[PDB]
């Protein structure tokens, strides 16, 4: 019944040396791991360490050009590291990215092992710069190695190939990342709840609509759950779980569950404009923890309002170490577009899942 964390401060060291207020901020781990030791959780969790991912693995989803470009960054000077960051969608770069990306991978890698391997039940990884927008061949919105697809195919290599993998990405954006790296595959069904507006949000592509189910033999393993018109939050995401999440896993019976922890869907977030509550992503951990005989590792994503990832994220935490859920408010009904995109989901999913029809 032991929980793993892993957090190491020399992620902190990626940074944005022409815009050093960018939202994407060093002190976005360094204060979810102060707010568990205010809590009192972090002295109930095993200490997991962190590591730099190899090469190696890195190749395991991403190009040896991607990597060996990511890789040359680190002895660029400032005028090359500001021209390759503007070669990308929303990307800084600075000399310490890539060792700091390699370390959030690293840091996946050891926690899914320690969960493998039975040394934990669970694990959260507390990691920066995020993963789920890079793609096999590319950086984008400030993620340059897939940390979570990375963490799918390290879990896979130390177990059989065919170890079934659910990724749930509740960050506030599309993981277009893990879609495409997973879309041809049985293997990683990737589940992703997003803020659509019908194409008119970050990262502004049709991909991410809930036609989108795979490709190949990946048919009906990808699941994207779209949010169109309305500030979502509690009542549209515990509907997205009841009627679409929780009913696919079970069926897919995952024997690991990764999720892609952004916390940019939270109250008070600068950037994603929902309302998710601390207490929400408390039972949406719960929930998830009643799958993989309680194999999750949470792993920090996107999210932007210090104080709200610090609570959040906190209280997914308290979830995994076996803490009651906190009460919820009054569920009020919900929003009629989230009716309408949840309906759109399960109408595109019932032919390749039966528990949802
Ligand atoms: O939080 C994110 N992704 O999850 C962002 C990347 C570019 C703008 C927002
Ligand atoms: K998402
Ligand atoms: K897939
Ligand atoms: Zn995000």
């Known amino acids: 019944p032991i929980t793993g964390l892993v957090y190491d401060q020399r992620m902190m060291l990626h940074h944005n040396m022409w815009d050093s207020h960018h939202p994407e901020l060093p002190q976005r781990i360094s204060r979810i791991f102060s707010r568990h030791e205010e809590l009192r959780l972090l002295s109930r969790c095993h200490r997991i360490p962190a590591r730099l991912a190899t090469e190696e693995e890195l190749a395991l989803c991403h190009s040896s050009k991607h990597i060996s470009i990511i890789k040359s960054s680190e002895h660029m000077k400032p005028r090359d590291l500001n021209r390759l960051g503007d070669e990308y969608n929303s990307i800084f770069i600075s000399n310490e990215s890539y060792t700091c990306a390699l370390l959030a991978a690293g840091s996946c890698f050891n926690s899914a092992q320690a969960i493998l391997t039975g040394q934990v039940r669970n694990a959260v990884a507390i990691v920066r710069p995020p993963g789920h927008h890079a793609?096999?061949?590319?950086?984008?919105?400030?993620?340059?190695?897939?940390?979570?697809?990375?963490?799918?195919?390290?879990?896979?290599?130390?177990?059989?190939?065919?170890?079934?993998?659910?990724?749930?990405?509740?960050?506030?954006?599309?993981?277009?990342?893990?879609?495409?790296?997973?879309?041809?595959?049985?293997?990683?069904?990737?589940?992703?709840?997003?803020?659509?507006?019908?194409?008119?949000?970050?990262?502004?592509?049709?991909?991410?609509?809930?036609?989108?189910?795979?490709?190949?033999?990946?048919?009906?393993?990808?699941?994207?759950?779209?949010?169109?018109?309305?500030?979502?939050?509690?009542?549209?995401?515990?509907?997205?779980?009841?009627?679409?999440?929780?009913?696919?896993?079970?069926?897919?019976?995952?024997?690991?569950?990764?999720?892609?922890?952004?916390?940019?869907?939270?109250?008070?977030?600068?950037?994603?404009?929902?309302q998710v509550t601390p207490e929400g992503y408390a039972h949406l951990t719960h929930q998830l923890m009643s799958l993989a005989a309680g194999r999750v590792l949470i792993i920090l994503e996107g999210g932007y309002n210090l104080t709200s990832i610090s609570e959040s994220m906190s209280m997914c935490t308290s979830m995994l170490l076996g803490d009651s859920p906190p009460s919820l408010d009054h569920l009020t009904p919900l929003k009629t577009s989230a009716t309408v995109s949840i309906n759109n989901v399960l109408r595109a999913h019932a032919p390749f899942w039966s528990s949802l029809r």
């Open 135 to 274: 793609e096999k061949d590319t950086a984008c919105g400030f993620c340059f190695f897939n940390t979570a697809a990375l963490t799918a195919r390290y879990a896979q290599s130390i177990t059989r190939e065919s170890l079934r993998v659910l990724i749930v990405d509740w960050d506030v954006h599309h993981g277009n990342g893990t879609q495409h790296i997973f879309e041809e595959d049985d293997s990683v069904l990737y589940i992703s709840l997003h803020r659509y507006e019908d194409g008119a949000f970050f990262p502004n592509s049709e991909d991410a609509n809930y036609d989108k189910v795979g490709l190949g033999k990946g048919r009906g393993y990808n699941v994207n759950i779209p949010w169109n018109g309305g500030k979502m939050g509690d009542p549209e995401y515990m509907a997205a779980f009841h009627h679409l999440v929780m009913p696919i896993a079970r069926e897919f019976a995952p024997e690991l569950v990764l999720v892609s922890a952004g916390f940019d869907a939270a109250r008070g977030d600068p950037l994603g404009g929902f």
